[PDB]
Structure 1
Amino acid sequence: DVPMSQPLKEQEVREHQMKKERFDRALESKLLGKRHITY
């Protein structure tokens, strides 16, 4: 047959979650960077 089209609801929720994650990661990197690595 033909390759199935990627679902519309799937790409909508994916772009929403990706926008939210980009904002969250930007805000987290802006807030002093709690993540650390030490020696």
Structure 2
Amino acid sequence: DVPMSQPLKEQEVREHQMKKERFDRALESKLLGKRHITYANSDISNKELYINEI
């Protein structure tokens, strides 16, 4: 019948957890992050089957 508010204990718990998470994310970013992204620059070859020209 009315637009009541969200829970209160849950709301404040979420606020505290968000503060902690923001702190941890800033700390990770300052440490160049623990996860990044890559592309492979080199491939294997075998001396039994070696190549130099076509």
Which one scores higher on RCO, CA 8 angstroms, separation ≥ 6?
2
Report runs of 4+ in structure 1 exceeding 2 Å deviation: none
How far does the alpha carbon of each residue in 1:10-35 deviate from its partner, in whole angstroms, 9 at most, with x for none? 11001000000000000011112221
- For residues 34 and 21 of structure 1, the distance between their equivalents in structure 2, rounded to whole angstroms, comes to 15
Q: More helix by proportion, 1 or 2?
A: 1
Q: Which runs of 5+ in 2 are unaligned?
A: 39-54
Q: TM-score, normalised by structure 2?
A: 0.61
Identity among equivalent positions (%) equals 100
RMSD of aligned Cα (Å): 1.0
Aligned to 2:45: none
Q: Which has the larger radius of gyration?
A: 2
